[PDB]
Amino acid sequence: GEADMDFLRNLFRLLDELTLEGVARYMQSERCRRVICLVGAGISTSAGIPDFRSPSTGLYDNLEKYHLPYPEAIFEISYFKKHPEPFFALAKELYPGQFKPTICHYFMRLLKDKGLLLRCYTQNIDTLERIAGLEQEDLVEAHGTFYTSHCVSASCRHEYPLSWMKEKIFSEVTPKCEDCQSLVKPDIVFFGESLPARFFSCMQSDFLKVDLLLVMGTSLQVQPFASLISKAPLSTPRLLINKEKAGQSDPFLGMIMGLGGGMDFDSKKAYRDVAWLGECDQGCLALAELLGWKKELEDLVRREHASIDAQS
Ligand SMILES: [Zn+2]
């Protein structure tokens, strides 16, 4: 309890039918023991996370002053080591503290609480999964996280807490290691940086025994997820909850998808994939209701959001 408050204070085998109802019944069967969620930006839009693709907002205004050689440079490790300022100016905007987890995030928290969540693979860097209660062990953050930070020197790797980093960034002080003076950066996985070994190992193990895949707030044709979805055993049901199904646009990926076990919701061969088109929060609300978890989710969201306001 006090630990939860300190945590927040510092921060701030098949379906009967191919329908959401069918998935809910499957989830209540004894065969559904391991669930993997693959999530993208769509699960955080209701929290107020902006569309990072638009220069519209004042998000990148502070950056049009450092003159980056190419867009990806702000997340490239060799560039960071020579010019850390741009990334830290952007991180000031991205660090957690201004947003609360959504209904969708707390739904995954329930899966955790109930012993159903094997793993949550996320493309986001808003830290909302962790704020919602998911622990490192439950997560494969494709692009890393701002929650942990480490000295960039391979011979050092000293770790630093969120409050240590948070203070520096808001004070606009470039974080330096206290042991070796090298730069310290949040554990966002930069181009040219190796990701934790755990990522590959989870990707190679988790889909062998998964009983259900919940894909939310992301297109199926996204670099990481495209491959993971086809790794699950052939009998594993897969549910997509997103506002719209993405269109084609690219022959190789498309063909590889059709030949490798990609989602099949509508063909004559469809047998285990379900698409539920609408807002992620609405979809999790719908699913929770079918499972008899409406009130529990309700109280969870209300209570966690209130703890965040209270801080303490
Ligand atoms: Zn160091």
Side-chain angles (χ1 to χ4, degrees):
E2 295 176 66
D4 292 341
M5 297 318 309
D6 290 322
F7 176 80
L8 298 179
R9 171 169 290 97
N10 287 314
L11 284 165
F12 297 88
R13 301 295 179 181
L14 43 59
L15 307 175
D16 314 308
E17 64 175 5
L18 300 188
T19 64
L20 185 69
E21 286 61 35
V23 174
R25 289 192 291 282
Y26 174 67
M27 292 182 59
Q28 303 176 304
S29 75
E30 65 68 51
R31 323 192 61 170
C32 188
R33 300 182 184 297
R34 303 179 180 67
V35 182
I36 290 182
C37 297
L38 303 184
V39 303
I43 73 167
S44 300
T45 55
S46 71
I49 302 289
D51 174 359
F52 299 106
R53 297 175 300 180
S54 62
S56 179
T57 170
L59 277 179
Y60 314 111
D61 286 59
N62 302 298
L63 304 178
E64 305 181 61
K65 316 173 183 183
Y66 299 90
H67 298 80
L68 295 293
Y70 56 95
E72 298 80 348
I74 197 169
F75 300 133
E76 194 280 313
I77 194 64
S78 67
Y79 189 82
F80 177 74
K81 292 181 175 170
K82 293 306 187 70
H83 305 84
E85 309 70 28
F87 174 73
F88 284 119
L90 179 63
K92 198 164 180 293
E93 305 290 359
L94 303 178
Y95 261 80
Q98 166 174 47
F99 306 96
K100 303 178 179 180
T102 68
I103 295 175
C104 180
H105 293 93
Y106 292 110
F107 180 84
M108 295 192 286
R109 166 57 179 289
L110 285 178
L111 297 175
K112 174 185 182 298
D113 295 329
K114 301 180 183 307
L116 289 302
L117 189 68
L118 175 57
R119 205 83 65 200
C120 170
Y121 287 71
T122 179
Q123 292 273 53
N124 307 327
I125 56 176
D126 51 40
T127 320
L128 298 180
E129 295 85 357
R130 286 162 183 268
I131 294 168
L134 295 196
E135 304 178 70
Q136 162 62 180
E137 42 263 54
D138 304 307
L139 292 164
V140 172
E141 295 158 296
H143 290 116
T145 179
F146 283 104
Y147 196 78
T148 56
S149 303
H150 294 84
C151 170
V152 295
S153 175
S155 65
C156 185
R157 294 278 73 193
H158 184 181
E159 169 172 48
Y160 294 83
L162 180 288
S163 62
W164 188 86
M165 290 294 313
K166 180 68 173 298
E167 180 283 305
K168 294 292 183 56
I169 294 170
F170 276 48
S171 297
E172 297 182 1
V173 177
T174 301
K176 302 295 187 184
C177 182
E178 308 181 319
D179 291 0
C180 74
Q181 294 303 307
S182 293
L183 287 163
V184 177
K185 64 174 273 292
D187 296 333
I188 292 302
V189 178
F190 277 18
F191 289 98
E193 185 173 43
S194 52
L195 27 60
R198 180 171 165 278
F199 285 18
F200 174 80
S201 298
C202 284
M203 287 186 296
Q204 289 296 92
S205 173
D206 298 342
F207 301 77
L208 299 176
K209 63 219 71 179
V210 66
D211 298 309
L212 173 67
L213 295 189
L214 296 177
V215 182
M216 307 179 287
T218 173
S219 166
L220 301 165
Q221 40 200 62
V222 57
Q223 188 179 67
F225 304 147
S227 304
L228 301 181
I229 292 172
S230 69
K231 268 192 173 60
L234 296 186
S235 60
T236 294
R238 306 177 298 182
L239 170 68
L240 170 71
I241 295 174
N242 202 205
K243 199 172 181 295
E244 297 178 354
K245 298 177 185 180
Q248 302 178 65
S249 183
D250 193 78
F252 282 31
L253 282 52
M255 180 71 60
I256 294 169
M257 296 182 52
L259 297 179
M263 297 292 182
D264 184 3
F265 310 108
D266 301 349
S267 82
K268 285 60 180 177
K269 305 182 181 180
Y271 70 93
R272 58 151 173 173
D273 298 330
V274 180
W276 190 94
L277 311 184
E279 295 300 296
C280 290
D281 283 349
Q282 292 183 53
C284 293
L285 285 178
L287 224 190
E289 195 172 359
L290 299 178
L291 298 166
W293 307 340
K294 181 183 176 180
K295 194 198 299 185
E296 179 168 39
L297 180 50
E298 182 91 299
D299 301 334
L300 174 57
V301 178
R302 197 182 301 103
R303 178 243 296 162
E304 291 290 348
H305 274 17
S307 296
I308 294 176
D309 292 318
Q311 257 78 301
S312 359

Coordinates of all heavy atoms in Angstrom, one line a residue, residues 50-61:
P50 N -0.7 12.6 -27.4 CA -0.9 13.1 -28.8 C -0.4 12.3 -29.9 O 0.2 11.2 -29.8 CB -0.1 14.5 -28.7 CG 1.1 14.0 -27.9 CD 0.4 13.3 -26.7
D51 N -0.9 12.6 -31.2 CA -0.5 12.0 -32.4 C 0.9 12.5 -32.7 O 1.0 13.7 -33.1 CB -1.4 12.3 -33.5 CG -1.0 11.8 -34.9 OD1 0.0 11.1 -35.0 OD2 -1.8 12.0 -35.9
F52 N 1.9 11.8 -32.4 CA 3.3 12.3 -32.6 C 3.7 12.6 -34.0 O 4.7 13.2 -34.3 CB 4.3 11.3 -32.0 CG 4.1 11.1 -30.5 CD1 3.5 9.9 -30.0 CD2 4.5 12.0 -29.6 CE1 3.3 9.7 -28.7 CE2 4.3 11.8 -28.2 CZ 3.7 10.7 -27.8
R53 N 2.8 12.1 -35.0 CA 3.1 12.4 -36.4 C 2.9 13.8 -36.8 O 3.4 14.3 -37.8 CB 2.2 11.5 -37.3 CG 2.5 10.0 -37.1 CD 1.5 9.2 -37.9 NE 0.2 9.4 -37.4 CZ -0.9 8.9 -37.9 NH1 -0.8 8.0 -38.9 NH2 -2.1 9.2 -37.4
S54 N 2.1 14.5 -36.0 CA 1.8 15.9 -36.4 C 2.7 16.9 -35.8 O 2.9 16.9 -34.6 CB 0.3 16.3 -36.0 OG 0.1 16.2 -34.6
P55 N 3.3 17.8 -36.6 CA 4.2 18.8 -36.1 C 3.3 19.9 -35.5 O 3.8 20.9 -34.9 CB 4.9 19.3 -37.4 CG 3.8 19.2 -38.4 CD 3.2 17.8 -38.1
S56 N 2.0 19.8 -35.7 CA 1.0 20.8 -35.3 C 1.2 21.2 -33.8 O 1.4 22.4 -33.6 CB -0.4 20.2 -35.4 OG -1.4 21.1 -34.9
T57 N 1.2 20.3 -32.9 CA 1.4 20.6 -31.5 C 2.8 21.2 -31.3 O 3.6 21.2 -32.2 CB 1.4 19.3 -30.6 OG1 1.8 19.7 -29.3 CG2 2.2 18.2 -31.2
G58 N 3.0 21.8 -30.1 CA 4.3 22.4 -29.9 C 5.3 21.4 -29.4 O 6.3 21.8 -28.7
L59 N 5.1 20.1 -29.7 CA 6.0 19.1 -29.3 C 7.5 19.2 -29.7 O 8.4 19.1 -28.9 CB 5.5 17.7 -29.7 CG 4.5 17.0 -28.8 CD1 4.1 15.7 -29.4 CD2 5.1 16.9 -27.4
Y60 N 7.7 19.5 -31.0 CA 9.0 19.6 -31.6 C 9.6 21.0 -31.8 O 10.7 21.2 -32.3 CB 9.0 18.9 -32.9 CG 8.4 17.5 -32.8 CD1 7.2 17.3 -33.5 CD2 8.9 16.5 -32.1 CE1 6.5 16.1 -33.4 CE2 8.3 15.3 -32.0 CZ 7.1 15.1 -32.7 OH 6.4 13.9 -32.5
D61 N 8.8 22.0 -31.3 CA 9.2 23.4 -31.4 C 10.6 23.7 -30.8 O 11.4 24.4 -31.4 CB 8.2 24.4 -30.7 CG 6.9 24.5 -31.5 OD1 6.2 23.5 -31.8 OD2 6.5 25.7 -31.9

